[model samples]
Target chain A: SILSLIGRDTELFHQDINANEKELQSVVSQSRFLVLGGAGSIGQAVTKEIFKRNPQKLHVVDISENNMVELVRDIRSSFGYINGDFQTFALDIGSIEYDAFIKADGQYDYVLNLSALKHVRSEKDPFTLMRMIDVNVFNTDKTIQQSIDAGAKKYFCVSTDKAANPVNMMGASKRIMEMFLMRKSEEIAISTARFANVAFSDGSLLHGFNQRIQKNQPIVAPNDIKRYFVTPQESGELCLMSCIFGENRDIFFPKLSEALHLISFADIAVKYLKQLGYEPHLCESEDEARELAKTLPAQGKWPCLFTSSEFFTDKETLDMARFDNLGIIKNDSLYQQELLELFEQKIGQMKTDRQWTKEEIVQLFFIMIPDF
Target chain B: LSLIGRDTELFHQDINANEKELQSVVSQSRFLVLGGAGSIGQAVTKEIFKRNPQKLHVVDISENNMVELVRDIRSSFGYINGDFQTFALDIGSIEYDAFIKADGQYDYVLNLSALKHVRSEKDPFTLMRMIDVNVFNTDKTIQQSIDAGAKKYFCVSTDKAANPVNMMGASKRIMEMFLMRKSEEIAISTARFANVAFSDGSRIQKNQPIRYFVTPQESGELCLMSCIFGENRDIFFPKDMARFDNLGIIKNYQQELLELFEQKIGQMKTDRQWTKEEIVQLFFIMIPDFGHKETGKYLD
Candidate 1:
């Protein structure tokens, strides 16, 4: 029933589920699905859901071999796994080489791309940010083209809430990826789902909270911090729903409760100590708290409040009724035909096997990014 | 070609007369003659010579022409023997720098050499060569002359320059465009018109012998006076000629005349006549060519 709902809601594919269960129950399905960057928290969850679909073939690609081993053990399928950095995975999706790789492996029915170098690290190093762009934006374009060449029917991308009016490099890169998918939705039915923080996900604050609890240390949080959090199951359900019901280039955002305001670590530590049957002295007021913080040698280790002057909005909240019953034409036959013709004309122009020289590449880069 | 022998002495006499007119206008000026070897160029050279310029620089491509020109002007003023240095050296090339550096000073530049006629149609590349020489080279010459502190530049063009019909005409028009464009920056101007009569390539002569036979009274001294002074004279057509018999000769000898009269009448007519007064007033009128007296009687 969940699979049917996902198929109906995300993939826009409606079938007589009861009739199919009776008629085709004995026939084996041979479709293949690929989950790129399948070892990360969201990636692992996506891998689990895709495995439940009982595809004839499945493949997991990630950078960590250890994570890949764990995924393989959990899934219990004789699936292919690739362990390498996604950026230099030797599968240049931008090149014709990737086409050969796909064709030799047989056509993929669907591909889920969830690779990125996140915001904090991207901001610290701009060159790394460019690398992130290559992986996040360019790689997605390559994968889409590859999928098209291999006759893959649909592609699903896991995007982020920060992609909306992104303030940081990671969000910007992800937004660019979203735009690329939207632009190419006609060629391959492309869809993206954006969500907030997943609770108990790898490297999540819950993991940090548990770590600090075991170490008998305070669980610290910034005073003015607020975040939207969802359980891992909710994220998995949303991902499945998006993949099934989403029309071409549809951006699926889950309808979740309002963001939770986090109380400061001082209150949490004091409350935890009391609950543990220890009498912990409380500081009198804000000034006393500041003085006490100064007296503590590890005060500098505390998480300092850093204000983020950025804003984000849910498209549903902004214009709820408009999107409520709306469905975009996943494949406008005329538009797709026109775009296919244009691409065919472009491919015709590239008759010669000429590799661009460095200078020419630089010139092309300048043409694309004129200010650079 | 026969017209050139007879026209030379007569043209010299007119030049002497125009020299007097120019002398009265300006006391002294420097004169530079480009393409001094060509027929029109030589005529301009002779006319400029009569003015008694403080200095004269005769430039041409032919070494022999330059030498003869120098010998001809040896008794008069200084002479510089060089190709229209801008053109012989490609202006677009680096060699132009050296060429300009060598031609130290000049006060005026006269551009005259060009590739002419239907010949340009057969080879537009050659026409481009002519443009380089006639148009672009003229530009370079003006620039060099200005750098050398020249005050004026006069480029000789043709009626082909006006509403050009073919490659030759287009080339001349391009030359005119270059001249007009440069007129603001430099003291430059162009004079374009129909062909000259008794220059190197015209049909007027003093010693054609048939002229003396045709009019015995208009012989010797009287003939000389008519040629030199451009005074009263009759340009004759044979009396015993018929329309069909005279067609080729008339077409050859009097093509311009036929064209003018045919254009005026609009219908075909034969043996058109003009009074001596009309001839003298219309064709013998002297219009100055670049401050030198141009004898319109030569056209007659």
Candidate 2:
């Protein structure tokens, strides 16, 4: 039922799972697992793959009660019964209920944190930027320490393609997060995945356009930007692969091939409108289109495309060298230790006003990723 | 301090070419300025006042800042022979709407109300407010001016809005979309400028900080010129900004920080408990230019 757009078909293949299937199955049936952020789009997909494999014990924890409920229902409908204790807890990892749950029964063979603030728009302010760091870095650290206490065998968190020679704050935050993750790797075996956008993922512009058309708002997109897309299942396969069999500090990404495609949002938007049986009506401005929204659908025309300033380049390109997965920088353990301590001290220092400025957060990011 | 560096000479040269046209517009026009107490607003007000406007009414949320702005204008600078007044009113409040309804007569309405910090985008709620104050407020004021039959509507965007990376910049980009839609309704012109080195709570003190400083007067002049002389959606930025690769001081903040975590966590025999709030609070504390107090240093 998935819509085929700029990327490969959902069921298409790149990496053959046959050679590693035996190795993957061995870890899956034996391990007791905790999947943090197991309610999200990728998280649910990961849970499904694990559930199908029949892991010993898989307990999913997430903040969204509704999504967690939906995940369990989806699993039960698809993969009847896992041979292990398959359960889900709807709680924020940053909450007292979650802490109490951990205190009472914090036992797991593996812990994977997939929660993150993954949007570049999220980094606009100091507050959201800090939240991004918390979700992307600090919270990951906290969960790793919790895994340490639980004596988990391995830890895996999701990183992004944006982390390679990052330009935006979101990418920089993830890069800095990787440094902190490298430091934490001293005590725990950690691996992560940095891949392309999951096609039709929530909060993504394509997904937003879906909502906009549903709401009768005009279809809008950035014309200049282009991105690669992987299916939600592929995202899960990548995460599970990294979690189960990856070496320490090993990061996984979809191998770039003829299969991968870099497509523009505007083109996908046009294709999307056509599939929905509506002819494209590009308005000059948002007002004109929105003004016409009242009757455009009846005419089989949608104000489907309503559209930076001048460092505004005609094209921005990302270098692919960092993701060859062969060579990477080794870490200095001294800096990681200093980071956690200073972060704690800064936390301790907050008294009346707990908010910081964007420059402060950006500086902290620079402090973490020096070359960035 | 002159942030214009060697280019200050060239930067000031644009003002000469536009002067006669700007003088003619400012002299004959009746104007209403929202946020007229702010640095850019005050700058536009004086730019209009000095050229001798037909009538000018200034509206702002801050009564004290308005008083201080008026006091500064009354003493150091001269006034217009036309009607000049200031009203303390929140643009979002009913009182401002009432004030507008009663007296919205003007040829130009300039909106300068906005929450212009990247830090303000840290939370979704705050980000929503930033959109409200920046995009919708600009839209609202434009509609207000259009309803009042004003000839032109002016506001300010940021240079950051161009090729936006940060959330604040992207939000302004979205606001620009709103502005483009509104351009069909009125003669709308907006200028995007860089960080004012000393506009608000700018200095790093109480503890202390060293920073790159930009004078409010310089920004004020640039802003007024943009409002008075530019065409639709013209975001003016001083072209002499220096790029920082040194990005010093912020250089190694978190590296040193997590090193301590690595050190202390290794040493700790006992686990000290902290709330999630406490842990999250660290993120905020870790992330300033509080604008310099113009009242404290310059006004008196």
Candidate 3:
């Protein structure tokens, strides 16, 4: 239903998952797993994939208490109870409580961090921009160090396609994080995946469509922008595969295939409305859409604001070709440790001073990535 | 001078010491708070509201923020018998003027409105809006307060205004000029303070610096102190938040900025295309030693 709403009827990663299903289950069932940000959309999917495989020990951590509850309910509803240890903790990875929790028992063969501040709009304010750095960059660094201390076999974190050539702070933060990941890769085995958009994921535009319909609000989306989307299951499977199968310092990403088509948000809005048996009533202004929403739904018309608001991995640099759908951007060596150290000092000082400007952070990002 | 755990000792002492006097003045006074939905404005509004003013009216552009302010106040301090109300009207709009004309009677008028971000000045258009909001809006509101026979006019300034390199701070400095011009007619007071810790736009994070900061309560107390106790032309500032020596740099700083503001503002009025770099050059015209790009080793 979600795939059809985004105008994709085929699963993008089925071929890859099917090929390695037995081995994937065998590895997962034998290993102890830790999933960070396990209450989030992608995290939930990843957690479920691991849970269904019956990992020896699976501990999920997320900051949201409510979402953790919902995750547990969803797990119970879908897969019932597992024979292995399955637990969730509502704890911020940056907090003292989480540190204590990890100190108590941080044993995990595979640790996957899916935590991120993934909004482009976060760059509008200096403070939020600072937070994006903390969550996406510093927190990732912190967890990797923790994983190293706990002697985790491999550490996996999700990256983004935007990190390839980051135009926004969220993407840049992740790009900076990749540097930090490279730094830690020397201490422990590390792998990551740069994912396409997860369709109708939490806090996404398509997710807002569900909210809008439920609240009788006008559907708002950019018509000018197009993006490639993967199913929630695909996102989970990709992260798990990279965790289990990927080589050290390997970055996995979805290949641009026939199944993965670029679709505009407006096009998706039309399909979504049609799927619900309502004709999309386009409006020029937000005010028009909002005003029309009062009476439009009753008339079998949905007010849609489509505004003009990609996934691919290159195969040329691929070191691993075991999975047909996945491509790996294998790094031969670590990034400049000095640059990572400098970024750490700069961010540390900013935190010490209790103030930083967006320009300052952006300049640092530029220094980190000369082209950024 | 972090106000993290010592918000009470750092800022609340003066207010607490003069609590009786503050209450006496506040309980009898009618208050008008401009931009009272914002972080600083909300702080100032709460301070004034809790004092049991005869008439406490808040004016802000954001209705959502105004609603939150009311909800917050209602949650904290259940009810005030005073004619407590809110006006979701932009101070620059004609509707605000009409609203003021309807009931402009107030003992004190505090202007807490500002476009307070340095990044906002990166664009020429936003820089112009900063001038309108920080300088002109203040001037207009001060004049309005004067016409309404308001006894005191309190405006918020920033520590950046003292040695301004950015347009946001420069705009506030220019606003000080306008305030001084009206100081002859009415008692005007202002504050130059540090960042409000964990205010609306800012959130507390571990990977943050421990620089000089004031709590929201401290910000409110500081404003109320200046509003009630401060004499005419007294620019109130936190002593700890200051980085440079108060070596009385009045040192013709104001004069130079005033001359530059007059020239640039006149040029801006001509509707000429202005670049951010051009405006930046204009800032350097007065303060030749402008060091905005210098990265702070600790608090830069």
- lDDT winner among the candidates? 3
Predict model 3's lDDT versus the native.
0.75
DockQ per candidate = 0.00, 0.01, 0.02
- Name the TM-score of candidate 2: 0.52
Q: In candidate 3, how many Å is residue B188 off?
A: 30
Model 2, residue A37: distance off in Å is 1.0
Q: What's the CA error at residue B106 for candidate 1, in Å?
A: 68
Worst 10 residues of 1 chain A by lDDT: A3-12
Give the Cα error of residue B197 in candidate 1, in Å.
99
User: What DockQ would candidate 1 receive versus the native complex?
Assistant: 0.00
Docking class of 1: incorrect
lDDT of 2 at B189: 69
Error of 3 at B280 (Å): 60
How many clashing residue pairs appear in each of the predictions shown?
6, 38, 18
Tell me the lDDT of model 3 at B179: 78
Lowest lDDT sum, 10 consecutive residues, model 2 chain A, at A308-317
Candidate 3 per-residue lDDT, tens place, A42-85, comes to 89999999999988999888755445666776777777897888
